[PDB]
Design an enzyme around this catalytic site. Sequence first.
Site, short mmCIF file in Angstrom:
data_model
loop_
_atom_site.label_atom_id
_atom_site.label_comp_id
_atom_site.label_asym_id
_atom_site.label_seq_id
_atom_site.Cartn_x
_atom_site.Cartn_y
_atom_site.Cartn_z
CB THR A 16 -2.14 -8.40 16.31
OG1 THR A 16 -0.86 -8.15 16.85
CG2 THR A 16 -2.02 -8.59 14.81
CG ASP A 39 -25.00 11.15 12.04
OD1 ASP A 39 -24.68 9.98 12.37
OD2 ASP A 39 -25.24 12.03 12.87
CG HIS A 69 -24.27 11.79 16.35
ND1 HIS A 69 -24.58 10.99 15.28
CD2 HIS A 69 -24.19 10.97 17.42
CE1 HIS A 69 -24.65 9.73 15.67
NE2 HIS A 69 -24.41 9.69 16.97
CG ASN A 161 -27.50 3.53 22.97
OD1 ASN A 161 -28.55 3.12 22.47
ND2 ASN A 161 -27.42 4.66 23.65
N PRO A 175 -29.97 -8.41 7.36
CG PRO A 175 -30.90 -10.52 7.04
CD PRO A 175 -31.27 -9.08 7.13
CB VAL A 177 -26.31 -3.72 5.73
CG1 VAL A 177 -27.25 -3.43 4.56
CG2 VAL A 177 -27.05 -3.74 7.07
CG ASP A 200 -22.14 -8.50 9.48
OD1 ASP A 200 -22.25 -9.53 8.80
OD2 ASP A 200 -23.07 -7.69 9.63
CB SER A 224 -22.85 6.44 16.92
OG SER A 224 -24.26 6.38 16.76
CG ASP A 260 -7.56 -11.34 19.67
OD1 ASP A 260 -7.32 -11.08 18.48
OD2 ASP A 260 -7.00 -12.25 20.31
#
Length: 279
Positions: A16, A39, A69, A161, A175, A177, A200, A224, A260
Amino acid sequence: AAQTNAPWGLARISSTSPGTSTYYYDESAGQGSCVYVIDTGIEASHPEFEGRAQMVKTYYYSSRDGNGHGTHCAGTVGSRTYGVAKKTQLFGVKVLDDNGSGQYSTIIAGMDFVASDKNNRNCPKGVVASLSLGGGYSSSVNSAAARLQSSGVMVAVAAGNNNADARNYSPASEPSVCTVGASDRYDRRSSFSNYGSVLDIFGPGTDILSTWIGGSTRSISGTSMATPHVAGLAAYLMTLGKTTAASACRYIADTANKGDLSNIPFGTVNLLAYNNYQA
Ligand SMILES: [Ca+2]
Protein backbone atom coordinates in the site's frame (compact mmCIF):
# COMPACT_ATOMS: atom_id res chain seq x y z
CA ALA A 1 4.86 -16.49 -0.52
CA ALA A 2 7.44 -13.80 0.08
CA GLN A 3 10.52 -12.89 -1.94
CA THR A 4 12.84 -10.47 0.16
CA ASN A 5 15.02 -7.80 -1.43
CA ALA A 6 12.90 -7.88 -4.58
CA PRO A 7 13.13 -5.24 -7.30
CA TRP A 8 11.19 -2.25 -6.03
CA GLY A 9 8.34 -2.54 -8.54
CA LEU A 10 7.39 -6.14 -7.58
CA ALA A 11 7.30 -4.84 -3.86
CA ARG A 12 5.22 -1.93 -4.90
CA ILE A 13 2.46 -3.80 -6.59
CA SER A 14 2.20 -5.84 -3.38
CA SER A 15 2.33 -2.85 -1.02
CA THR A 16 0.00 0.00 0.00
CA SER A 17 3.00 2.24 0.72
CA PRO A 18 6.32 2.80 -1.09
CA GLY A 19 9.62 2.19 0.50
CA THR A 20 9.86 -1.53 1.01
CA SER A 21 11.57 -4.36 -0.86
CA THR A 22 9.70 -7.68 -0.29
CA TYR A 23 7.24 -9.08 -2.85
CA TYR A 24 4.26 -10.64 -1.16
CA TYR A 25 2.05 -13.17 -3.58
CA ASP A 26 0.07 -16.09 -3.47
CA GLU A 27 2.57 -19.22 -4.57
CA SER A 28 -0.20 -20.30 -7.48
CA ALA A 29 2.02 -17.42 -9.23
CA GLY A 30 0.20 -17.60 -12.55
CA GLN A 31 0.28 -21.31 -12.95
CA GLY A 32 -1.99 -22.37 -15.92
CA SER A 33 -2.09 -18.94 -17.59
CA CYS A 34 -0.32 -17.76 -20.79
CA VAL A 35 1.27 -14.40 -21.49
CA TYR A 36 2.26 -13.36 -25.10
CA VAL A 37 5.08 -10.78 -25.15
CA ILE A 38 4.78 -9.07 -28.54
CA ASP A 39 8.11 -7.28 -28.89
CA THR A 40 11.75 -7.96 -30.06
CA GLY A 41 11.54 -11.59 -28.97
CA ILE A 42 12.56 -13.45 -25.82
CA GLU A 43 15.90 -15.07 -25.04
CA ALA A 44 14.15 -18.22 -23.91
CA SER A 45 17.51 -19.85 -22.97
CA HIS A 46 17.91 -17.52 -19.98
CA PRO A 47 17.79 -19.87 -17.07
CA GLU A 48 15.60 -16.89 -15.31
CA PHE A 49 12.75 -18.52 -17.53
CA GLU A 50 13.45 -21.98 -16.41
CA GLY A 51 11.90 -23.69 -19.59
CA ARG A 52 8.62 -21.75 -19.62
CA ALA A 53 9.35 -19.41 -22.55
CA GLN A 54 8.95 -20.24 -26.22
CA MET A 55 9.31 -18.12 -29.32
CA VAL A 56 6.41 -19.01 -31.41
CA LYS A 57 6.52 -16.30 -34.22
CA THR A 58 8.58 -13.86 -36.03
CA TYR A 59 8.14 -11.54 -39.00
CA TYR A 60 11.91 -11.12 -39.52
CA TYR A 61 14.71 -13.39 -40.70
CA SER A 62 15.28 -15.15 -36.90
CA SER A 63 13.08 -15.17 -34.00
CA ARG A 64 15.95 -14.24 -31.63
CA ASP A 65 15.91 -11.04 -29.55
CA GLY A 66 19.04 -9.61 -30.72
CA ASN A 67 17.76 -5.94 -28.94
CA GLY A 68 17.14 -7.30 -25.23
CA HIS A 69 13.79 -5.09 -24.90
CA GLY A 70 11.46 -8.07 -25.35
CA THR A 71 13.55 -10.19 -22.98
CA HIS A 72 13.38 -7.51 -20.26
CA CYS A 73 9.66 -6.98 -20.52
CA ALA A 74 9.13 -10.76 -20.53
CA GLY A 75 11.28 -11.15 -17.43
CA THR A 76 9.03 -8.71 -15.57
CA VAL A 77 5.98 -10.62 -16.54
CA GLY A 78 7.37 -14.11 -15.59
CA SER A 79 11.01 -14.68 -14.78
CA ARG A 80 11.68 -16.65 -11.62
CA THR A 81 13.59 -13.40 -9.76
CA TYR A 82 12.28 -10.60 -11.52
CA GLY A 83 8.73 -11.57 -12.51
CA VAL A 84 5.27 -11.00 -11.23
CA ALA A 85 3.76 -14.26 -12.34
CA LYS A 86 6.69 -16.56 -11.66
CA LYS A 87 4.78 -19.92 -12.96
CA THR A 88 3.20 -18.48 -16.16
CA GLN A 89 3.91 -19.76 -19.60
CA LEU A 90 5.49 -17.11 -21.87
CA PHE A 91 5.06 -16.99 -25.67
CA GLY A 92 7.16 -14.57 -27.83
CA VAL A 93 6.15 -12.83 -30.87
CA LYS A 94 8.97 -10.91 -32.60
CA VAL A 95 6.99 -7.79 -34.37
CA LEU A 96 10.20 -5.53 -33.62
CA ASP A 97 13.61 -5.90 -35.25
CA ASP A 98 16.53 -5.54 -33.46
CA ASN A 99 16.90 -1.94 -33.15
CA GLY A 100 13.25 -1.70 -31.79
CA SER A 101 11.55 -0.75 -35.05
CA GLY A 102 8.43 -2.23 -36.44
CA GLN A 103 6.25 -1.27 -39.25
CA TYR A 104 2.62 -1.09 -38.30
CA SER A 105 1.34 -3.54 -40.67
CA THR A 106 3.59 -6.28 -39.10
CA ILE A 107 2.59 -5.13 -35.58
CA ILE A 108 -0.99 -5.72 -36.73
CA ALA A 109 -0.02 -9.11 -38.14
CA GLY A 110 1.24 -10.00 -34.63
CA MET A 111 -1.57 -9.07 -32.88
CA ASP A 112 -4.19 -11.10 -35.04
CA PHE A 113 -1.62 -13.89 -34.72
CA VAL A 114 -2.24 -14.07 -30.96
CA ALA A 115 -6.02 -14.12 -31.28
CA SER A 116 -5.57 -17.22 -33.47
CA ASP A 117 -2.67 -18.89 -31.70
CA LYS A 118 -3.96 -18.89 -28.30
CA ASN A 119 -6.07 -21.78 -29.71
CA ASN A 120 -2.89 -23.75 -30.24
CA ARG A 121 -1.81 -23.38 -26.60
CA ASN A 122 -2.75 -24.88 -23.22
CA CYS A 123 -3.99 -21.76 -21.10
CA PRO A 124 -6.82 -23.05 -18.90
CA LYS A 125 -6.45 -20.05 -16.56
CA GLY A 126 -6.47 -17.28 -19.00
CA VAL A 127 -4.55 -15.48 -21.83
CA VAL A 128 -2.76 -12.11 -21.67
CA ALA A 129 -0.81 -10.08 -24.06
CA SER A 130 1.75 -7.52 -23.14
CA LEU A 131 2.55 -4.66 -25.95
CA SER A 132 5.45 -2.47 -24.83
CA LEU A 133 5.49 -0.48 -28.05
CA GLY A 134 3.44 1.97 -30.15
CA GLY A 135 3.77 4.95 -32.41
CA GLY A 136 1.16 7.80 -33.64
CA TYR A 137 -2.59 7.29 -33.73
CA SER A 138 -3.74 4.71 -36.26
CA SER A 139 -7.24 3.31 -36.55
CA SER A 140 -6.08 0.23 -37.93
CA VAL A 141 -3.35 -0.43 -35.13
CA ASN A 142 -6.08 0.41 -32.58
CA SER A 143 -8.59 -1.89 -34.31
CA ALA A 144 -6.14 -4.83 -34.20
CA ALA A 145 -5.99 -4.18 -30.36
CA ALA A 146 -9.77 -4.28 -29.99
CA ARG A 147 -9.88 -7.55 -31.97
CA LEU A 148 -7.22 -9.17 -29.83
CA GLN A 149 -9.05 -8.06 -26.69
CA SER A 150 -12.51 -9.01 -28.03
CA SER A 151 -11.03 -12.61 -28.94
CA GLY A 152 -10.73 -13.07 -24.97
CA VAL A 153 -7.26 -11.95 -24.27
CA MET A 154 -6.41 -9.50 -21.65
CA VAL A 155 -4.59 -6.80 -23.62
CA ALA A 156 -2.03 -4.52 -21.73
CA VAL A 157 -0.44 -1.59 -23.79
CA ALA A 158 2.14 1.03 -22.94
CA ALA A 159 0.65 4.52 -22.68
CA GLY A 160 3.82 5.98 -24.28
CA ASN A 161 7.25 8.04 -23.25
CA ASN A 162 6.62 11.60 -24.56
CA ASN A 163 5.18 13.22 -21.69
CA ALA A 164 2.07 13.83 -23.80
CA ASP A 165 -1.65 12.97 -23.73
CA ALA A 166 -1.65 9.33 -24.94
CA ARG A 167 -5.27 9.74 -26.99
CA ASN A 168 -2.65 10.66 -29.89
CA TYR A 169 -0.75 7.36 -29.69
CA SER A 170 -1.39 3.78 -30.80
CA PRO A 171 -2.22 1.23 -29.54
CA ALA A 172 -2.63 3.32 -26.17
CA SER A 173 -5.61 5.30 -27.20
CA GLU A 174 -7.59 2.27 -28.10
CA PRO A 175 -10.65 2.26 -25.30
CA SER A 176 -11.30 -1.27 -24.86
CA VAL A 177 -7.80 -2.43 -23.83
CA CYS A 178 -5.72 -1.63 -20.65
CA THR A 179 -3.35 1.40 -21.17
CA VAL A 180 -0.59 1.54 -18.65
CA GLY A 181 1.49 4.59 -17.44
CA ALA A 182 4.38 4.62 -15.36
CA SER A 183 5.65 5.48 -11.85
CA ASP A 184 8.70 5.72 -9.86
CA ARG A 185 9.90 4.28 -6.53
CA TYR A 186 8.77 7.45 -4.70
CA ASP A 187 5.26 7.27 -6.23
CA ARG A 188 5.88 10.08 -8.72
CA ARG A 189 4.03 9.78 -12.19
CA SER A 190 7.70 8.94 -14.26
CA SER A 191 8.89 12.06 -16.06
CA PHE A 192 8.56 10.58 -19.55
CA SER A 193 4.68 8.94 -18.82
CA ASN A 194 2.29 9.83 -21.15
CA TYR A 195 -0.98 10.72 -19.39
CA GLY A 196 -4.59 11.46 -20.33
CA SER A 197 -8.23 10.19 -19.51
CA VAL A 198 -7.26 6.96 -22.06
CA LEU A 199 -5.02 5.60 -19.31
CA ASP A 200 -6.73 2.77 -16.99
CA ILE A 201 -3.93 2.21 -14.55
CA PHE A 202 -0.36 3.00 -13.55
CA GLY A 203 2.68 0.51 -12.89
CA PRO A 204 6.35 0.69 -11.84
CA GLY A 205 8.36 1.97 -14.79
CA THR A 206 11.21 4.08 -13.66
CA ASP A 207 14.72 1.85 -12.79
CA ILE A 208 13.09 -1.51 -13.37
CA LEU A 209 15.55 -4.36 -12.90
CA SER A 210 14.84 -7.29 -15.22
CA THR A 211 16.47 -9.83 -17.55
CA TRP A 212 18.60 -9.11 -20.59
CA ILE A 213 20.13 -11.09 -23.43
CA GLY A 214 23.30 -13.08 -22.89
CA GLY A 215 22.01 -14.22 -19.86
CA SER A 216 22.29 -11.20 -18.23
CA THR A 217 20.21 -8.55 -16.07
CA ARG A 218 19.78 -4.40 -16.36
CA SER A 219 17.73 -1.88 -15.21
CA ILE A 220 15.96 0.34 -17.74
CA SER A 221 13.02 2.64 -17.73
CA GLY A 222 9.56 3.36 -19.67
CA THR A 223 5.88 2.74 -19.88
CA SER A 224 7.24 -0.38 -21.59
CA MET A 225 8.57 -1.63 -18.19
CA ALA A 226 5.29 -0.66 -16.47
CA THR A 227 3.10 -2.63 -18.97
CA PRO A 228 4.40 -6.16 -18.19
CA HIS A 229 3.73 -5.46 -14.36
CA VAL A 230 0.02 -5.23 -15.27
CA ALA A 231 0.19 -8.12 -17.67
CA GLY A 232 1.84 -10.35 -15.20
CA LEU A 233 -0.60 -9.18 -12.51
CA ALA A 234 -3.57 -10.01 -14.57
CA ALA A 235 -2.09 -13.57 -15.24
CA TYR A 236 -1.69 -13.86 -11.45
CA LEU A 237 -5.32 -12.80 -10.86
CA MET A 238 -6.66 -15.21 -13.47
CA THR A 239 -5.08 -17.98 -12.07
CA LEU A 240 -6.55 -17.43 -8.81
CA GLY A 241 -9.95 -16.98 -9.95
CA LYS A 242 -10.47 -13.29 -9.28
CA THR A 243 -11.09 -12.06 -12.62
CA THR A 244 -11.19 -13.03 -16.31
CA ALA A 245 -9.44 -11.82 -19.44
CA ALA A 246 -12.40 -9.55 -20.35
CA SER A 247 -12.98 -8.27 -16.79
CA ALA A 248 -9.26 -7.92 -15.62
CA CYS A 249 -8.55 -4.27 -16.51
CA ARG A 250 -11.77 -3.31 -14.54
CA TYR A 251 -10.90 -5.58 -11.86
CA ILE A 252 -7.30 -4.15 -11.35
CA ALA A 253 -8.68 -0.60 -11.36
CA ASP A 254 -11.30 -1.53 -8.75
CA THR A 255 -8.62 -3.02 -6.48
CA ALA A 256 -5.88 -0.43 -7.11
CA ASN A 257 -4.41 1.81 -4.67
CA LYS A 258 -6.31 4.97 -5.23
CA GLY A 259 -4.63 8.61 -4.58
CA ASP A 260 -1.53 7.89 -3.95
CA LEU A 261 0.89 9.32 -7.16
CA SER A 262 2.25 12.85 -7.62
CA ASN A 263 1.42 14.91 -10.68
CA ILE A 264 -1.78 13.32 -12.05
CA PRO A 265 -2.41 15.89 -14.20
CA PHE A 266 -6.11 16.72 -13.88
CA GLY A 267 -8.18 14.30 -15.58
CA THR A 268 -5.78 11.34 -15.45
CA VAL A 269 -6.52 8.40 -13.16
CA ASN A 270 -4.52 8.28 -9.94
CA LEU A 271 -4.90 4.28 -9.70
CA LEU A 272 -1.80 2.16 -9.03
CA ALA A 273 -1.71 -1.56 -9.67
CA TYR A 274 -2.05 -3.74 -6.56
CA ASN A 275 -2.38 -7.37 -5.81
CA ASN A 276 -4.23 -7.09 -2.47
CA TYR A 277 -2.38 -10.07 -1.03
CA GLN A 278 -0.89 -8.70 2.20
CA ALA A 279 -3.81 -6.38 3.06
CA1 LIG B 1 -10.17 -0.51 -20.64
